[PDB]
């Protein structure tokens, strides 16, 4: 059993365990206490288990947010980074909230920063929003972008109808069966 | 008065934190050298947009 | 303002003066919102 | 005018108030050592006007109070 | 005998085993102390089951307020926390209600955030409002959408009945039978 | 078993051995505790691996972000630095969600810098996004340079469809069967 | 045996051996545990060691940063010093992303560095950028000026397709065959 990773976390070795088995490839999970998961494969597997570690960029890298920038214990705080800290907490509770929809598997939500804000002597611009989603298969997935549009427009001051864009799909297909020990 | 009552309970904040901080470490002067002009010329910067806006 | 464009060709002894040592980020402030009396108060 | 001495005892009474702290952190570090005696105004008086150039609070409180009446 | 999660909260292993055993795989909910739960599953169920952890992105975060980066625990705080922190206690209180109305299970309610435009001589903006909600089979949801447009109206200072968005759907089918344990 | 490389982590070992794989030589991972791992080759295959570390410029070196060069730790914080971890947060944050689209394996996303625009009395530019990808095989690869092309533009204050450009690409050919051992 | 260099690094001798090697003389890396790595050549191979040694600048000096000019532990920065910072980070990270594209093993990009319109009122000008990089053989190397072109020319505020120069090459030939010992 050659040694593919160790030392991961939790929900990383979810990842490339799920990632290895679509490609017909079995990999075991072993604990190790403090230190970590690891992940081991069979041997003729290896060769073709580090092309697809390399590929997809295995093992994932913690999501990043505009809140762990500035944090909330720092002594005196701009009004930069309150706005800052404003809008990421408020992309947060709407990519939650779009995923209570009715056929919504995952979405993700992006809103248009200020960063000049009163600097200049300037009023501030229009805001603009863009979203992803995934659907579950077998849905009208071209009935169901204006319900995300209508969702999203009154969620804020004044954004128009052309300042939106929703790009969404539908899921791959579903890997139900084991991948199989290579016989040798 | 709400910008009057921040600003004026930030000062105060700030003398119980900056004047108060080497009461209870001498109870080194390089490392204590770069940190009060990092809050003094924040608080300063921030008091102007609580100023002229 | 005929006679007056004599004095304006005079002052220009003291307007390349003010500014070279006047910054031009100031200097075009009090014009957008080089004359005469936009480069004293920038001076 | 009344409207108008009114803000600016506003706006003058809210510089006033970061150079107040500065004053007791050069106070409160001298009577931390033994120099008890010793005035404060001698040491004070540096840093209360470099945070005023660091701030380049002259280009400041300049461009601000124009953008209060103005526009560009 | 294999384990997908461990160390979990108690709202997290209720709803993992909530997901799983809609699509025919049964858990365990194994307690292990004071270090959290843990499920696992069977070896025939264990790869349908880690295809699923990827797919619904399970565990799920803790759901996160506006008012979580602006803390009330702190000593001195800014008229924009103070308004940011007031808007968001608003903004549960009204979903709180929405939940006592009759067929109503979960409602979710956003409301525009304007804190940049209170401090300058322009007024403040009209205030929005957006709301999702789920609702027990067998109601005429094409009605019921009025009396929640009535009820948010004239809860706030002055909005108007375009500025609000109801998006609402009924609860998806009952899950009673007991999924099965894999044979062999 | 000469040595050629050692001292490496994990994420480097696996690409050493990654990229000696595809061209017929096998390798060899050894753990020494804390001292990292190490790399082994055959003795003829030693000439073309030194060949190859020396062509592909191994190991690699981390990758870089801009808000590494102005830590939160830095108790003096300018606006020109609070502009700058803003940025390098939301093009750390587009390219993590440019990986959630049908068949997109790896992305990149850079933006225009502008930091000294609030000190000037000049009006700010527009903002320049650009993007690299890396999608599936079997992909109609020439139709999905709208999709990016939409995503990417109302997501930020104002841009065209002339400031966005997108290189994007398929995958290379597979590499599954192992190297072999040189025989003698 | 004579030993010609002693103390290297683990890069540097990788760096000694592949230009050795290429020459039709073979050379012995000996690890010494803290006082690093050291090549030794036989007495045949001397005469001709030496002279690559001379003409190519072995051993290679580590490579150069700008942003290592201006540390970020320093008690006061400049403006010059934290736009020097910023744009030393850009350059890296270009250069970065150049090499993953489709057929590109190594890439260098120079940003034109801006000082001294920052501190007196004179405007900035145009950013101008240049770039190498080193192709895969077998491609056709005149058609891939204008996809590096477009890349580079949306990451910046204000470049031109007369201000971006490219200048790439193919590899060398492949060494894959061994020197060969001395025989007297």
């Not at chain 1, 990383?12 to 490839?25: D, G, P, Y």
């Not at chain 1, 209570?100 to 200049?120: F, K, P, Q």
């Not at chain 2, 940190?35 to 300063?44: A, I, N, P, Q």
């Not at chain 4, 470099?50 to 103005?70: E, H, N, P, R």
Request: aromatic letters at 10%; proline letters at 5%.
């Amino acid at each position: 059993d050659k040694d593919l990773l160790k030392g991961l976390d939790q929900e990383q070795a979810n990842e490339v365990i799920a990632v290895l088995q679509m490609h017909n490839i079995e990999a075991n999970k072993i604990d190790s206490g403090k230190l970590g998961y690891s992940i081991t494969v069979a041997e003729p597997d290896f060769t073709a288990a580090v092309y697809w570690i390399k590929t997809y960029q295995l093992p994932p890298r913690p999501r990043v947010e505009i809140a762990q920038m500035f944090p909330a214990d720092s002594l005196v705080s701009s009004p930069r980074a309150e706005k800052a800290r404003l809008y990421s907490a408020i992309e947060q509770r709407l990519e939650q909230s779009l995923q209570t929809m009715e056929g919504v598997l995952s979405a993700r939500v992006h809103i248009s920063y200020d960063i000049d804000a009163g600097e200049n002597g300037r009023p501030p611009k229009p805001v603009h929003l863009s979203a992803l989603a995934v659907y579950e298969r077998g849905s009208p997935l071209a009935h169901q972008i204006s319900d995300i549009k209508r969702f999203l427009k009154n969620s804020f001051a004044d954004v128009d109808y052309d300042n939106i864009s929703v790009v969404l799909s539908e899921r791959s297909d579903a890997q139900l069966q084991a991948p199989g020990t290579p016989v040798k | 008065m709400d910008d009057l009552v921040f600003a004026g309970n930030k000062a105060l904040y700030l003398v119980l934190i900056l004047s108060g901080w080497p009461t209870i470490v001498a109870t080194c002067l390089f490392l204590l050298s770069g940190w009060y002009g990092e809050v003094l010329l924040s608080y300063g910067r921030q008091v102007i947009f609580l100023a002229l806006a | 303002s005929s006679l007056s464009k004599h004095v304006d060709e005079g002052l220009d002894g003291y307007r390349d003066y003010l500014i070279k040592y006047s910054d031009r980020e100031l200097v075009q402030f009090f014009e957008n919102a080089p004359s005469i009396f936009a480069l004293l108060p920038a001076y | 005018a009344l409207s108008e001495i009114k803000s600016a005892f506003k706006i003058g009474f809210y510089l006033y108030l970061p150079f107040v702290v500065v004053d007791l952190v050069v106070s409160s570090v001298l009577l931390a050592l033994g120099m008890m005696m010793m005035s404060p105004v001698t040491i004070s008086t540096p840093i209360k006007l470099v945070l005023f150039v660091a701030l380049d609070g002259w280009t400041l409180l300049s461009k601000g109070l124009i953008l209060q009446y103005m526009d560009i």
